[PDB]
Each structure stands twice: as structure tokens, then as C-alpha cells.
Design a protein around this ligand. Structure first.
Ligand SMILES: Nc1ncnc2c1ncn2[C@@H]1O[C@H](COP(=O)(O)OP(=O)(O)OP(=O)(O)O)[C@@H](O)[C@H]1O
Ligand SMILES: [Cl-]
Ligand SMILES: [Cl-]
Ligand SMILES: [Mg+2]
Length: 264
């Protein structure tokens, strides 16, 4: 189904700061909002790209949809099974395959296609036991991207109506990340309602709707075209760099943040 948030606002409630960690008790006392006057309308099959200054409420907006945070004000509609893929890539003890199809019914196909799209083929081929290689909790010897991709694969493979993808593209193997973005998010999932948190411009360009957060507020919402005209200062500064999307995730974020401060 689609997802809608009409003038939503949420506040810090004890525990949510404890949940996220997977001073808070001051924010809770003061009663400051984590998100404020959040507005969005996504149609089934559309892909929403979320971005913004670091620590602006992106991961939180997600927890909201997940129902781990409630909307003190405003309406929030969406339905069906939702699949979440956190910034923290978690690996459970078992095989690469086991990690991906765990708790869900198997489908030779569906599986092969996800594994392919997520670019896991280039990985499991380096292993003597392919996707049958046994991992130890946390997949410690694996690389950041390898875990991220395995983590994504697991999320994508699940059958759901809404897919919440929190910053999966933030590692050094940037080229692979670009391939994954296309074949998985843009192609393979093209007809699935999906929200993607990111710091890569290209992801905005190719999104149906954009959403830029900053200091818990909505700095912008709307298509990419609307973005260029209604936020010329921002859009100009960001399209300035030739190869921004290949800057470290840290560098990308530090710019978005600084830029967002200048044109608040
Ligand atoms: N109203 C507020 N007053 C003071 N600090 C806040 C407020 N709202 C958020 N913050 C700070 O900014 C953070 C934003 O939370 P959240 O992680 O949901 O946003 P985010 O953009 O996903 O952050 P990150 O991108 O680093 O994961 C809060 O955890 C807290 O550190
Ligand atoms: Cl390692
Ligand atoms: Cl690692
Ligand atoms: Mg986050």
C-alpha cells in the first residue's frame, strides 16, 4: 500500500532513546519534539528518498512508521507488512543464505534474484562454500559493505508492502553501492513502496519524492525538480561537486549539514 503522514509530530518518550542506541532523559523532561510538522504522501510503488543534516531525525521518522514512536499530533496512514533494514547491519550465527531467508518461506527464485541484485554473487563466489559459508554472529571478518549487502538482502527478500531502508549505502566500495542502488532499489523493487535514507544525490534525482530533514524539522518535501527551483541555494551548492556521491559517507554528511545550516 502507500504511506501518508499528514502534519505529524512526535516527542521524546523515555525508552525511545534507549531503543535508538541499537542526554536523552533531559530531552524527555524538557518535552522537545524529535520530529515536527512532518508531511508526506507516498503512492504504492513510489520510492521516497530521505536525507539531511546528520542527527536530523531520519532514523527516527522510520521508527515512527515502525510504531516504536508515536505521533503526538497529526495523522499517519499506511498498511501491510513493513520490512526494516537498520543502519546497523546485524549478522546472526548461521550461513550467508540462512541469514537472508531466515524465518521466511524459501523460493529458489526470489532468493537467486535478491542475491543477484544485491551484488552478493561477487562476494559468495570468493568463498569455497559460496552462500553456504558459515558466519559467526556479527560477521566480524566480513567487510562493512558485505554485511550491509547481506543485511539488505535479508530485508528485500522479506515479502512486504513497505520497505524501510536506513542508510545502507555508506561504505568504501562505492561502485558496488551504485550497482546495488540500480539493480536492487530501482529495478528489482521498482513496484514496491520503499523509503530510502541516504546521503547520495543520485538517489534523490532518481526518487519519486524527496524529504530533507534538519534540526527535527522538514527543510523540504517534494520532487527533485521542485527541489532545484524552490531551494536554489541548496541545490546549487550540492550539484556543484562533480563526484559527491563518491565522497566518504562522513564527508557527504558533513557537507549536507553545513549546507543546511547556511540556507536554513
Ligand atoms: N528536539 C531535539 N532537541 C535536542 N536534540 C535532538 C532533538 N531531536 C533530535 N535530537 C538529537 O538529534 C538526534 C536525531 O535522532 P535520529 O537518529 O532519529 O535522527 P537521524 O537523522 O537518523 O540521526 P543519524 O542520521 O545520525 O542516525 C537525536 O537522537 C538527538 O541526538
Ligand atoms: Cl573485518
Ligand atoms: Cl567489517
Ligand atoms: Mg540514522
Amino acid at each position: 500500500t502507500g504511506i501518508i503522514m499528514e502534519n505529524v509530530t512526535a516527542f521524546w518518550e523515555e525508552g525511545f532513546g534507549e531503543l535508538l542506541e541499537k542526554s536523552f532523559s533531559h530531552l524527555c523532561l524538557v518535552g522537545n519534539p524529535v520530529l515536527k510538522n512532518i508531511n508526506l504522501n507516498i503512492e504504492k510503488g513510489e520510492m521516497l528518498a530521505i536525507t539531511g543534516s546528520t542527527g536530523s531525525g531520519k532514523t527516527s521518522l522510520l521508527m515512527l512508521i515502525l510504531g516504536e514512536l508515536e505521533a503526538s499530533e497529526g495523522i499517519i496512514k499506511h498498511s501491510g507488512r513493513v520490512s526494516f533494514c537498520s543502519q546497523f547491519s546485524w549478522i546472526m550465527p548461521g550461513t550467508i543464505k540462512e541469514n537472508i531467508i531466515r524465518g521466511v518461506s524459501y523460493d529458489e527464485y526470489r532468493y537467486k534474484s535478491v542475491v543477484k541484485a544485491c551484488q552478493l554473487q561477487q562476494d559468495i563466489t570468493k568463498f569455497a562454500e559460496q552462500d553456504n559459508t558459515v558466519l559467526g554472529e556479527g560477521g566480524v571478518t566480513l567487510s562493512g559493505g558485505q554485511r550491509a549487502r547481506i543485511s539488505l538482502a535479508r530485508a528485500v527478500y522479506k515479502d512486504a508492502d513497505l520497505y524501510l531502508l536506513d542508510s545502507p549505502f555508506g561504505y568504501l566500495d562505492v561502485f558496488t553501492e551504485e550497482q546495488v542502488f540500480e539493480s536492487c532499489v530501482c529495478k528489482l523493487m521498482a513496484n514496491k513502496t520503499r523509503i530510502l535514507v541516504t546521503s547520495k544525490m543520485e538517489h534523490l534525482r532518481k526518487a519519486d519524492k524527496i524529504l530533507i530533514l534538519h534540526q527535527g524539522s522538514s527543510y523540504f518535501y517534494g520532487t527533485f525538480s521542485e527541489l532545484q527551483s524552490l531551494r536554489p541555494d541548496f541545490s546549487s551548492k550540492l550539484m556543484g561537486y562533480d563526484t559527491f556521491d563518491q565522497f566518504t559517507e562522513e564527508r557527504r554528511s558533513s557537507i549536507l549539514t553545513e549546507t543546511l545550516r547556511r540556507f536554513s
